């Protein structure tokens, strides 16, 4: 195995694969030269990322794994635009560029873990920005290290022509729905584990770009010109999210998103550091927000909101409210509430595309 | 105690004192004192005391109290820009008001807050802030972190003739900087300022066109500006005879590009032992060969052209130590003075003997 490559050409995909990179082989990147193509692969056994770069000078084929962080750091630290000569010699990777010589230890290609790569049951393409939006609008809702396996990840659902993302930790929910012109078929649902979905969202930087998606029984695949991403899915059945969404809420409240966010963060300072309880007292054209902690400290704040109807005292985790408010993209925010024991449904001002559910706390 | 103050006016000094609060509970409080039309804010960690003063505009009722520093600062930070804040003590509580936001904080009495009694010292002078900071910035890395020899964990500030000098050393390497300061001194004065205090002092010296008033005493060092008075306790002990540490017999003089050497040392550092950080230098006429090996038999090799004429030298150094020096050398070139493999290296700027750096070899 031997090739030459520019520092920049190698660094781009090598930085991509290094973002996914404990068994020792898992900290290596798999390098494969087939013809004039270099493929770089990184995996953490849940997610596999592959980067492809075209080689210009003649290249001798082969394959090998080398420590990813160390190759990337070596490549990063080299002078700009320098040509790098990479060769395998006696279980070692030899790297030459200019007047610098590096020898790296290697593990055999066969040791590197592989993925099933099935055709799947559905595929479509979509604008990277649209897929990224579904994830960014809902990702905070995901549960972290919950015993229920399904909670630690994001549901992606195709139904009719519609792509939908749902995330919930069992206390709060975030859902977003987009018209994707996906051909009508049966409902398709996948649960992409938390780490993989966040990684995927970060990867979708091409604003005018497309992403090819494959849904299977055990994997999702995202493919673009730069990379091919594969994640294992969460085995299990996602809860019926439809039941969680509150319905028939009598009270409707409209408020300035920025004023509510600032008033909630101000009061949050003196709320219980673990439970983050905030008390809301709603009355005609008025929201009182109060916060108390174990040291008997108190923050109070009043905000004028558009609201007409019965008084309502209700408790909510302030962090949850702030998570919602920080993804609402409109100046105003709509809150839909019923009673003290019932959850809140939050929408953008004019749009039902994203919906947020926040269950209350006992006061 | 009762006063009104603009949010911006209160935040500046509050932010300053908050940087020294890290536990006994009163140590995480800020001491607030209203005397006439002045508000003083005091923070301490029992080694360093920082005081901020602000002139109050509206009438103010005097008194004193301590309140949690971080919480007051966060509350002040989160408030609307340019708002007027009303502060008043009521029944062992601080009541903070601004617009429609009410806050009640728990308080501890002023008696509990530690007091530092400030003598006049034996020497005082003023100096440009940026000169004092330079002394510290050029020299701070050399300090020991948690050595058993207490004097090493700090920086020596010495006044001899009209020269202000800073010395730091962990026993493996040394950093010194000397500046003419026209300071009248009948006798030589030494102080050892603890590392937390000296680093904090450096960060506070932010006015490039400003001056700082210094007092040296037997047990304290005091630094005064319009914005603050910083007092630190000193390390009780005699600082080592640093002059003996400096190498005198060097027969080999090397000149090199600072940026090329830095880049070549960081590149080779990647494959050096992660704990011992050993690099090998091979010096011959016009050339420096840098090699790094680790326990996994990985190797980085690099050559740099340098101005040098004389006998061959093989010598080992900790590469972090060399990089620490190179990252504070302000000139495009750097001078290395060496003698033998078992003897220390002396490093200077290109044209100047003002800063001097000593690094002991490995092996």
UniProtKB/Swiss-Prot annotation, chain A:
Is-annotated flag, keyword Signal?
A: no
Q: Which GO terms describe its biological process?
A: DNA strand elongation involved in DNA replication
User: Which SUPFAM superfamilies would you find in this protein's record?
Assistant: DNA clamp
- Mind telling me which SMART domains this protein's record contains? POL3Bc
Location, primary (coarse class): cytoplasm
Q: Which GO terms describe its cellular component?
A: cytoplasm; DNA polymerase III complex
| Keyword field | Cytoplasm, DNA replication, DNA-binding, DNA-directed DNA polymerase, Nucleotidyltransferase, Transferase
What protein name applies here? Beta sliding clamp
Source organism of the structure: Pseudomonas aeruginosa (strain ATCC 15692 / DSM 22644 / CIP 104116 / JCM 14847 / LMG 12228 / 1C / PRS 101 / PAO1)
Taxonomy-wise, where does this protein's organism fall, top ranks first?
Bacteria, Pseudomonadati, Pseudomonadota, Gammaproteobacteria, Pseudomonadales
